């Protein structure tokens, strides 16, 4: 079914955001793993799979609307060298992605692409969950101190 062109560009831009998050979350996960911060590896990994699922949804949707999914262009990763910095970097990235999502959802509505919209509202809801997680971790770091926070990441949560 021939989709609206500008909807497809939004879908590709959103896809672009997910491709960045996939990589940044996966590296972060395995950095934590290497450092033995077992709990942060499990969570960041599971957020990486999340973004993968999101990318898949965009890709299928773009293809269905008869556009060309763009997996070639990869935006800026910002990795960071310590826990706080890296969590903070993931948070900034989610915030920028939520902004793009808000814009695309409004536009899909105005051209009547209600199913693209509905898929996007779902993804936003997942993002908003990732945002909540990061914000919470970052405040815990400050409330309990970095040393206690790190000790609390050594074992996986059952």
Binding site, annotated residues for heme b: 52
Q: Which is nearer to a second copy, 85 or 132 (CB)?
A: 132
Tokens of 107: 């536009």
Is residue 43 involved in binding ligand HEM (CB under 6 A)?
A: no
Tokens of 124: 């936003």
Closest residue to Fe ion, based on beta-carbon distance: 54
Using alpha carbons only, give the angle 88, 9, 87 rounded to the nearest 5 degrees: 5
Give the residue among 20, 155, 146, 153 at the shortest CA–CA distance from 94. Answer: 20
Tokens of 149: 């926070």
CA atoms of 104 and 85, how far apart (whole Å) = 29
Residues found near a second copy in the complex (CB under 8 A): 1, 19, 23-24, 26-27, 30-31, 33-36, 56, 59-60, 63-64, 69, 71-72, 74, 76-77, 95, 98, 102-103, 105-106, 112, 114-115, 117-118, 121, 124-125, 128, 131-132, 135-137, 139-140, 143-145, 147-152, 154-155, 157-158
């Amino acid at each position: 079914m021939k989709g609206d062109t500008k909807v497809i560009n939004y879908l590709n831009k959103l896809l672009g955001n997910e491709l960045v998050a996939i990589n940044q979350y996966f590296l972060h996960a395995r950095m934590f793993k290497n450092w033995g911060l077992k709990r942060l590896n499990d969570v960041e990994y599971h957020e990486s799979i999340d973004e993968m699922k999101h990318a898949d949804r965009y890709i299928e949707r773009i293809l269905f609307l008869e556009g060309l999914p763009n997996l070639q262009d990869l935006g800026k990763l910002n990795i960071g060298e310590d826990v706080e910095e890296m969590l903070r970097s993931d948070l900034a990235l989610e915030l920028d992605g939520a902004k793009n999502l808000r814009e695309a959802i409004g536009y899909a509505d105005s051209v009547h692409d209600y199913v693209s919209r509905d898929m996007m509202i779902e993804i936003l809801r997942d993002e908003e969950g990732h945002i909540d997680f990061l914000e919470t971790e970052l405040d815990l770091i400050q409330k309990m101190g970095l040393q206690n926070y790190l000790q609390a990441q050594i074992r996986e949560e059952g």
